[PDB]
């Protein structure tokens, strides 16, 4: 991805987008009880913790585009992956608008809490001023989409989240894009049925984990990932994507039945027009993280990429024996015979991708079911029910989350969430987590589930 042009918003008639000054993140009552190193991401240029230039840092993800045509390998990769998705029978028919907006099986209702994008953010208009959960009104919505139309710019926000010391100091805060409400609704109409099918079929046919429930899905991953494990990471996956990968995505959508006119919103995604605070800029390439189904589209492109890179390094590879599940940039995959992921990494560098060993590893050593992670969680079979696989979130990451809060009014929901992750670490680890929670008075006012209850409901859930 590449920023082709950047100007002051006022030169184009755009108002300044007023965007959060300080973080909503505050130390929680558990800040002193648990150990932790993460702090809220930098959101302001003057942050005293910055040891780098903030604006330069947040845009350094746009490392550029490799300008190439869709080559041999990409075509065979698009064909093979397409044929997998052919078996799902994804309807290319528009989703009817009340489904797309107010919810349906496989596609949650449009989030009424997030930004409405441009121009609503500039007019003081919130989503709850256009949409009502209880009335399911489409009257105002239709009026707005007719009024302001489509391909509106995107509002860029800095993501308010906990980050490491390294990333706070390098100012490498993450950027998410708010699509206009018009374009979110139009995109969920066009690809609603695709999002529904993917959400309802996580695994090795979709090559996608978007929407999965790890309490359930993780016992199925070892059954699907048959051979030797492949696993690695990206740096700045979303903004490293070159336009050629969107051409591949457009090709895969057309093989699925989408017309050229329906794939035009892949061009709205690839060549985007953004509003960040007082600046305004165009980007050629890169996935605008935060737009509609960017996670699904990232996952689809990642199926194209890995397949492409296998074809180019291992001529004679048999993609029919290849399995992979992707969540955006996060990949877990398998093949019957060993594969050198460092070779795949070098090849990806030729396509403008930054691939590293899995989990900040020093080298691309052998990935095992002991050390592999997915969605930051480890894999640990139950000792009593071996075919049952615990998703194990490390207690370090739970410790980091519990020390902060964006609203202490949700202390009960937040801590109970962490419990549902923490118990998979085992009963001794769990009761220590509970013990230290109850060493603060709030901890004793909370309804925390018991270990036996968690494990029972888990075993029963199957």
Automatic annotation (TrEMBL):
This is Genome polyprotein. The lineage of its organism: Viruses, Riboviria, Orthornavirae, Pisuviricota, Pisoniviricetes. Signal peptide: none annotated. Homohexamer; forms a hexameric ring structure with 6-fold symmetry characteristic of AAA+ ATPases. Interacts (via N-terminus) with host RTN3 (via reticulon domain); this interaction is important for viral replication. Interacts with capsid protein VP3; this interaction may be important for virion morphogenesis. Interacts with Viral protein genome-linked and with protein 3CD. The chain holds residues 1724 to 2185 of 2185 of the full protein. Transmembrane segments: none annotated. Protease 3C: Major viral protease that mediates proteolytic processing of the polyprotein. Cleaves host EIF5B, contributing to host translation shutoff. Cleaves also host PABPC1, contributing to host translation shutoff. Protein 3A: Localizes the viral replication complex to the surface of membranous vesicles. It inhibits host cell endoplasmic reticulum-to-Golgi apparatus transport and causes the disassembly of the Golgi complex, possibly through GBF1 interaction. This would result in depletion of MHC, trail receptors and IFN receptors at the host cell surface. It is found in: Host cytoplasmic vesicle membrane; Host nucleus; Virion. Residues 227-343 form the RdRp catalytic domain. It comes from the Viruses. Mg(2+) binds at residues 233, 330. Belongs to the picornaviruses polyprotein family.
